[PDB]
Amino acid sequence: NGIKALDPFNFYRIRTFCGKMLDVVGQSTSDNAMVVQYSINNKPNQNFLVFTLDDGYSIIAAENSGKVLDISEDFFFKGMLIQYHFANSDNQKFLISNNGTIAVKRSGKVFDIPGASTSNDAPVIAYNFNNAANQKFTFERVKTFQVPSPSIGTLPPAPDFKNDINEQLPDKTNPVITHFSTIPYIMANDATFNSHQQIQYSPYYKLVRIQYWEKVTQRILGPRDDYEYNKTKGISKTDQVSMTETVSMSVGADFGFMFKGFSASLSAQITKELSVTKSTSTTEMTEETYKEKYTNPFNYELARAQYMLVNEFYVTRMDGTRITANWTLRDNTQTVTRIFP
Amino acid sequence: DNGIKALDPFNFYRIRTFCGKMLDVVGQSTSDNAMVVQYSINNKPNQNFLVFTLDDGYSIIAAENSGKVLDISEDFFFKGMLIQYHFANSDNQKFLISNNGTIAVKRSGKVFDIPGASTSNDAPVIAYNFNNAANQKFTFERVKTFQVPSPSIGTLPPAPDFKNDINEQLPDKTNPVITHFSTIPYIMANDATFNSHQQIQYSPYYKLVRIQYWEKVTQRILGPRDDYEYNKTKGISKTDQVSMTETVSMSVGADFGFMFKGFSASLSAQITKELSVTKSTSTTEMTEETYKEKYTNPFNYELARAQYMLVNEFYVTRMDGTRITANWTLRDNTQTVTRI
Amino acid sequence: NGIKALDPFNFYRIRTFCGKMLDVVGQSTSDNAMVVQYSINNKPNQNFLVFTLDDGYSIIAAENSGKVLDISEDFFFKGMLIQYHFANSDNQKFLISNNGTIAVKRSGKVFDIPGASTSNDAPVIAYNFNNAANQKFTFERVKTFQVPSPSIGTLPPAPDFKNDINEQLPDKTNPVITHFSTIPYIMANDATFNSHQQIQYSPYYKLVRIQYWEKVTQRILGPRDDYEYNKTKGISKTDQVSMTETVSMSVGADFGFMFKGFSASLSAQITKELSVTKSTSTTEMTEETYKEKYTNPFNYELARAQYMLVNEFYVTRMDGTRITANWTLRDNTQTVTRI
Amino acid sequence: NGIKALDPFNFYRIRTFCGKMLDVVGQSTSDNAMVVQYSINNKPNQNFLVFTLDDGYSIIAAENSGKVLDISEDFFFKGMLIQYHFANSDNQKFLISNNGTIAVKRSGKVFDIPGASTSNDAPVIAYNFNNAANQKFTFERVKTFQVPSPSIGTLPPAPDFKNDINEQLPDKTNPVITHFSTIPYIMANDATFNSHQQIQYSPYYKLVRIQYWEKVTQRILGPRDDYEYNKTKGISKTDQVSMTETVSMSVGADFGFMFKGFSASLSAQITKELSVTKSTSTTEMTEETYKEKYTNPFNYELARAQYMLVNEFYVTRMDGTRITANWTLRDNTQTVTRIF
Ligand SMILES: [N+]
Ligand SMILES: [N+]
Ligand SMILES: [N+]
Ligand SMILES: [N+]
């Protein structure tokens, strides 16, 4: 037996050995954080989302709030299952297996119904694995939702001269959405939605990548004339801060992404989905504008235009509402030079 | 509904739930936390309890397995759960045991409840609104019985008197006699050499004992018109005041009444009754002071004058009689006898 | 909260609050009539047909036999859900609503899984509606079948003389199927199929109406000649008995249909589908043959032909197999006379 | 394993595998005869009496109605467990075993919770034994009652003359209660108590035997003097019919009891408790009165007195209330003759 695979866009019902379902409210526990197995209610308190991370451990989020399942390390109530806001803690990371066991990352203990209770307010306490039926759970599909996909297009080539030395080439190519990454609400910080609102309306947020060619300079100069032009590379501090505040990410000096806090758990997925490299750099990149000088090497009058690859990254809600401005990263490494024949 | 259920103080009781299981402060899956759950009969101290009934009619339920008592959590995350916690004079630890079978929390009025009427071995207890369901009813069973030794009691003798010998030296103090004692639960008394667990094991009840005797302030023989000044002392020492408060959270007020602090207040009525002492109405605490008094003989014939002052000594012992504190001495200035 | 609509030609699976299905056999109930909540087995004992009547209430029939869901009125087992043959009784009539509730017609009580049992042999007991999850059920399409439709033709006009040749006109026009009605097997009494066989092979029966003109008389006579000819109206007793025996219907004296017993439940539907009138007559119609006399009013040789509208009604199985002879009704009211 | 033994005078609670109890009313089944699994109520709906018969099979009676557990033979509800008025039917007779299984006498299948339902209002259906947990049940003592026992005395000897030929001996000895038999209410036909009333107030009825000597004749005779006197033996028709109507018993011609209907199931107990013989006679006894003649063979003047053993049988409720007249049986076989 191995890791259980669950579709991400389904709300799930967690069925216990006796046919009752985990409920984050309960009857006698209505006024506290306890999670108990209760009779089927067909209510959001019994609906969950399972977010599987790179390490194979998953985050289980209740629909009733934005909060997730948590195993208390409290001295007085050690081992209890409660509902607590996401804090990227090992007691909140669970391993769902085909055998039916939900295993805590922090401790090898698994979900267990104390005394194999069949009662409606029976709590869940972490217990050493013993292969008893009361330790086994089944996930049922409750309802399904869809995440719209943005239209995707490939990057066009940098514009080129067409037999006219005095033609002005476009300042930039039409921006195209080349990639996007689908991440859970727990990762994205939305100023205008609280955690509960998020899971209700935007369970997954989308991080979208647009690529286009930006014209650094175009000038016509004499056979043996030189000129100096400004060129800009990198990403602004404001974009760096905003990226970190929203998704706990920044861009490293090596043009790789730096994953901080919660984001690190999905580093592999995000890099793969955006076609970007994980940073190996200690320091974060800054926007730099510097002067570069070009001299005409040919004796005939010559026209030169240079394009730089530019990336814009932004986060949207599931529906597509954009919650942040585009974060601009200029890659000086990827550049195309155009001249008149 | 029917009324307060009365339980003998010197019995350990087993609390039986609706399904025939017993409340257990350890549990199986809860062994590593403070949760109290109904479990199958094991006849072990984790299922044994001792009941302390206070003046207000509410009782404290103390486990035998530890010195801790039953408590209802007010934590945001685990509100209403029943756990074992060190005793504090808080209403969530005070419960009303009634003939109808309900254990009611003082703070909230809610009663002990087995969630979902679970018959399971680790079913927890949660305070829940009274609905007269079977799962809210509990029965107390006698498990074991113990006896508290009582100190021998004698009346205060009369102050010593002269027997036709003007040169006789009267006793400096009369033989001390134990006039009163008060039986209090271990939760009230702080024992330096026994921890709470040890206390419930070995001295569930402590004894607060009152000794009374006459102490001779002065004796003198003088001529028709002779003057002298002698020391006289009244009150209770600062050290005794601190020790009394430290040990049983009590002190003596300036009006010769006792001041009850913290836990002690819960049994004030019992203690005052058992010791035959008055509750203080004074804000300030009494202090021992020594002052000089001057006497002149009013008669032309030679006479001898001796004065005795009534002295109280209060001390705390363990159930077996082991003394854990020095006698706390209170000098009653108003109660004095003069002999000629 | 309104009435739920289900396609008639689908077999349905009744899904309970816990994802288990109603099963008319069960494990511990295999030897009795009880219907219980059971895990999916993909067998006909979990397959049902829903027959919606004129009153909006529906009949639920299990595929395993011809029998339908029934709520016991037994003193000892009152309120239990069992499988029992159709008897057109209110305890067998159920109201399916969008809220998910199946409501008994006789009482206000609805289907309920006692104690919200998740067990494989949990019974079903009628209980007062409380909006609990254990009272809500979902119908899922399992498999579907098609009911053939007969070729439909309009009534031709009665034939007329051509060129005054005084030729012999057709005795009857080519019969055409003007109408047909699709009804469930529970309404039809089939001698050669038992109830179990019916639901297996002919879930719905078809009642077909054919109309054509019948020549009552044709004769050529001289000026002012009179003659008496026989004319026949109505429906035969044998057809009346066979119609009642097969579909519990008869034809009333007012040329309307009389719906008796089970048939009444679909009276409106049937009348609408056949374009026929519900009878207001106390007595049933009989076939009558009587003489009618004509005198030529015109001072010349004249040819007269009269046609009467004739209806033939018959019942077939879903595949089209005809189980009864045509029932003939001659409509005296609708007649055409030509010269 | 073997037959489980239960004390007869206890009300019992039948516990299912999940800790819930059999309830003869239920919630959704409140309006029908079904017996279902339900949570503990501490109510008579869940209280039963177990009547163990001679064959080892037992009858379980509900306190809430007086009706007994019955396994339906209905075509539509075959195998369902309901409460039904008592009849001497094998489906109502169950075998309680140490393993926890309740087996129907009529059909081998035992009590089973369908689908191992842990829910309330879960039915009980007879199912083939498979040793599953849902087939095992445990009996808990709920409450206990006592059946008063009448004072028992031995039969005194028939009276004898005391040196006076003119002395008149007593017509009968003071009657004494030699035996009684404790029988369940289902056996006894009580006009004034219905089944519900019976199980509430007289779960067991008592059949009591009184014995005494009755003087058939007394006379003093001279030499060779003879006379004819009436003698009566047997039991009256009215007593026979009343005995049959009340406890379905009668007395056979061989002075043994004939057990009819349910009574036969308890034959061994009753015969033992009353010290009476089970009848082997085809026909029932009738009361007969006939003349018997005695001749004095001796020339002494002699007084002759003859006593016949007389039995009185009657039925009382548990408290002792008598519901029927004494049934009089005169045994001519046991007779004593006295001479002077
Ligand atoms: N509520
Ligand atoms: N243990
Ligand atoms: N089945
Ligand atoms: N009940």
Residue numbers in the entry:
A (entry chain B): 17 to 357
B (entry chain C): 16 to 355
C (entry chain D): 17 to 355
D (entry chain A): 17 to 356
Kindly provide excerpts from the paper associated with this entry.
Cry78Aa is a novel protein identified from the Bt C9F1 strain that effectively kills rice planthoppers, with median lethal concentration (LC50) values against Laodelphax striatellus and Nilaparvata lugens of 6.89 and 15.78 μg ml−1, respectively. Here, we report the crystal structure of Cry78Aa, which consists of two domains: a C-terminal β-pore forming domain belonging to the aerolysin family and an N-terminal trefoil domain resembling the S-type ricin B lectin. We also found that Cry78Aa binds carbohydrates such as galactose derivatives and is essential for insecticidal activity against Laodelphax striatellus. Bioassays showed that the NTD or CTD of Cry78Aa alone has no toxicity against planthopper nymphs, indicating that its insecticidal activity is dependent on the cooperation of both domains.
Here, we resolved the crystal structure of Cry78Aa13-359, which approximately resembles full-length Cry78Aa. Consequently, the structure of Cry78Aa13-359 was resolved by combining SAD with molecular replacement using Cry78Aa155-359 as a model. The final structure of Cry78Aa13-359 was refined to 2.9 Å resolution with Rwork and Rfree values of 0.279 and 0.282, respectively. Cry78Aa13-359 exists as an X-shaped tetramer in the crystal structure and the four molecules are nearly identical to each other. Mol A and Mol B are arranged in one plane, and Mol C and Mol D symmetrically protrude from the plane by ~15 degrees. Taking one protomer (Mol A) as an example, monomeric Cry78Aa13-359 exhibits a rigid rod-like shape and comprises two domains, the NTD and the CTD. The NTD of Cry78Aa13-359 has a typical trefoil shape which is usually composed of three sets of β-sheets and is also known as the trefoil domain. The CTD of Cry78Aa13-359 is mainly composed of several long parallel β-sheets and three α-helices, and is regarded as a β-pore-forming domain. The NTD of Cry78Aa13-359 glues four protein molecules together.
